[PDB]
Design a protein around this ligand. Sequence first.
Ligand SMILES: O=N[O-]
Ligand SMILES: O=N[O-]
Ligand SMILES: O=N[O-]
Ligand SMILES: [Cu+2]
Ligand SMILES: [Cu+2]
Ligand SMILES: [Cu+2]
Ligand SMILES: [Cu+2]
Ligand SMILES: [Cu+2]
Ligand SMILES: [Cu+2]
Lengths: 337, 337, 337
Amino acid sequence: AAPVDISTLPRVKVDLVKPPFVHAHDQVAKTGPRVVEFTMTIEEKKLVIDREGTEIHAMTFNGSVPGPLMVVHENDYVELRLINPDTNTLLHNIDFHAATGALGGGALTQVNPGEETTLRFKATKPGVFVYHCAPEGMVPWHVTSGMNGAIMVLPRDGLKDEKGQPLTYDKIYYVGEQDFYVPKDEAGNYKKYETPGEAYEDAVKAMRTLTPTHIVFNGAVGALTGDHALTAAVGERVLVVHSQANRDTRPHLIGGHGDYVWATGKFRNPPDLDQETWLIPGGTAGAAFYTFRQPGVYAYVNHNLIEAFELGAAGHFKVTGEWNDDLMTSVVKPASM
Amino acid sequence: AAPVDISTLPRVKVDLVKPPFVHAHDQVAKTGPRVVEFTMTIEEKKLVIDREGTEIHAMTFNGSVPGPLMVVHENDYVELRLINPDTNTLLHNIDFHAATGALGGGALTQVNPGEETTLRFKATKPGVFVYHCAPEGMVPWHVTSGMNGAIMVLPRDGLKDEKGQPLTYDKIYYVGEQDFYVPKDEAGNYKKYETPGEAYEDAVKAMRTLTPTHIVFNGAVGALTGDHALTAAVGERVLVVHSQANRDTRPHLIGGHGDYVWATGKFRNPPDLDQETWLIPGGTAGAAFYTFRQPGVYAYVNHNLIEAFELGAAGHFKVTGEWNDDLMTSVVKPASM
Amino acid sequence: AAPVDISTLPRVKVDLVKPPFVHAHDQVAKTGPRVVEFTMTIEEKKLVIDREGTEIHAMTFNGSVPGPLMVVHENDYVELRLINPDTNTLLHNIDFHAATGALGGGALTQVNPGEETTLRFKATKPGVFVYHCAPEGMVPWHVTSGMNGAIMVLPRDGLKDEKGQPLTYDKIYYVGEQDFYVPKDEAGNYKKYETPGEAYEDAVKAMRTLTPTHIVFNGAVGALTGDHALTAAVGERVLVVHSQANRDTRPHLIGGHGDYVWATGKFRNPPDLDQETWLIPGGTAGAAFYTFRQPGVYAYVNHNLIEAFELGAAGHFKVTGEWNDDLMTSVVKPASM
Ligand SMILES: O=N[O-]
Ligand SMILES: O=N[O-]
Ligand SMILES: O=N[O-]
Ligand SMILES: [Cu+2]
Ligand SMILES: [Cu+2]
Ligand SMILES: [Cu+2]
Ligand SMILES: [Cu+2]
Ligand SMILES: [Cu+2]
Ligand SMILES: [Cu+2]
């Protein structure tokens, strides 16, 4: 039996958006299988990651930490043009956990500054998956410099609950959680470096402590707060895709739940119901579906609360609508007696 | 459609017990939905947490670390009177992971010393859940000072196995596992502090190491041993609820199993069978059901064995009854030859 | 009702093999229940664990880290003769997480140098399980010196998928992952020690940091690479059993998946499908089944990539067969433009 002639399939070009937003897509596939075309441009850039002003040299897909969320359906082909402009200094590549073969693509996509490449793979398994740079011999340095994102491979008939009934989200957000290892001197202050090569050994030393200096959502402390808080309305169904390319996390919606959670991200499995908190292992993307029931502020965190509130792994939702006093009320407001 | 008039519902007052014991309750609900009334009094107090005599300033619900286990059924209302006496010095509140809205209750329950408040919420999801103090801006300090416990929301028809058959426990225990971060000087000795404000920065520094100094059950090294070992008889069905409000744990019954385990604690999901060890993520309560088959001593641990046997995360069961040589026997006792 | 007379049952002697290989066995039981006889000889020995030449004093079952994989079926009896030769210096024992009673066997198997013992237990629960030494008062020291392995208790009708259909592996490998805590001086160099007693306090100090110095597969950095890479052919079904007796891990096949994964190792549960990465809690064995679809090199890692590529937790597969360009292809090889 001969393979399909891939040139006979539809091609659709996706235009990516910056996290936590997600490029519009259809949950249930409205066409047959397609070759879904993506382009990303690698950008090495300085980023300020905390309120103190700590500035690092980040390594990004498309200018953001995390890289953007890509969305396809099961048995589509993903065709990525990966560009490493000559304004960068390092070698990069890309590994898709969604893909099969060649170290997820990394063995086929090594691009020096001034080079580009195009990789195609068939997205044979539904789920959310990490993608990340992984140059042989310097893999964790690139990943923990921010060079990771995620791809969602939807079932062609959309998401389903534990009984096989549909689950349809109204909104989707992508939270990439990044552990950074900013090198410290003996007194505990961050060091700064003149070139990437001069940074490398202390970057390795800092990583080998296994103790992040910062753990952030969307690339910085506070990034998903204030004017950039996530939003929803009461009654809205929201999917939050959450990735961590290098270290475990334990997401939690403060004031809510994960009504349906694929903690390790793979949609052929029935979701776990009614979660308070769930474990997304390092190297994984997970997804949680929730229908909001109360308005107000929520905090969405890694529930190692030190990691959340001291190291950065906390964002907010601002939710609009009516308050339900049956679900919760202050019977007696705080008072002296 | 109008809401139910909650004043028409039965009220029942619960009288809490100190962990690891659990206030008597009925597994299968013997009434319709009720407003279940609880009272807890916050107590800041010194606690000796290890064999060396290390003394910390703990922040407790009801005088214990962990706070007591509360038990209700799905779609009961929990009505908690939370009292912060004027003998305390700090601001406190309470967040229930079982609840929906207002940061689990924390936004509605801020009490200064000399204040009290009453919160009501509907327990809409079955499972075991963490509760903890969470004052904005100093959340992990309160949690990791011991200010956390758990609530069990039973299905109205009790627990069920993976096939839908009942599971009925004979005994229940609540193991709260606490990570403490006692500040250390450069030589490695614990520091002591004159006031909570003078402690705060080094408490933050110590937490940011992400390395607990102590990890204990029921508030101290050895608390669940000796005259306070857990007990059972051969053939008894025991549910062990285990919470960790801030850091992952991996419980294990040495010499036994978790016959049915809800590792992330939520009873609408079928349990995992025959577990040796299970991962309870930080910010979660889990529950394990076991039928004892052999007498003797067991050790119940976090199976990072350093955490268990060096840092404190180990308790014991003393089990009474007949020894089964079919299940295990010494064929040849240790000997020279 | 009287117990079975165990002397009426067949006895079969197993001859163990060194990891990552596994002693031949039948997936589906070809006999009724048997007493399966194993012998292991404890060996304390020096091991070089990294490329730098760091040499530790390891504590082994049968000369290897990990100890060999034992394989039986559900409701067989395991009868282990455990020998501690007089050439060793320490007390040892064995705890099987598969067993019920007497701290998994440890209370019955304490052997001084020059002693042996024989333990029997009934393997009543199917799954992969850790076994490890656990001498009272010095448990984590022995475990983290390498004194751990695993046992697989197969269902009598072999493995099944989430729908109850058979899963049959063609190849099985056992990856034991070991966290070592080599004591460091203040400058960060490893210390060496003249006797085990002189090592003990700093071993304890090093363990209490909770920061491994090395995390390795099969006892050393690079052990499962080069001439000792794992092998498969395209189309082959491979089961990888993975244990970690003391600390969480998150395995990942780089370029592949876990098609069916029992992350916490217990076969009465349906497997998780299509995993990218899975969490094996410390104190647990897990198992992943994969059918290879592409040839070439794969890296099998703990996907804390620092742990993998800096601390040692990485091995390789070399896979033989045809490349499938439908599944993945380089459309445009890296080039300037
Ligand atoms: O109650 N959430 O931190
Ligand atoms: O065998 N339990 O540590
Ligand atoms: O893409 N695996 O590191
Ligand atoms: Cu890169
Ligand atoms: Cu990866
Ligand atoms: Cu408090
Ligand atoms: Cu919380
Ligand atoms: Cu030993
Ligand atoms: Cu153990």
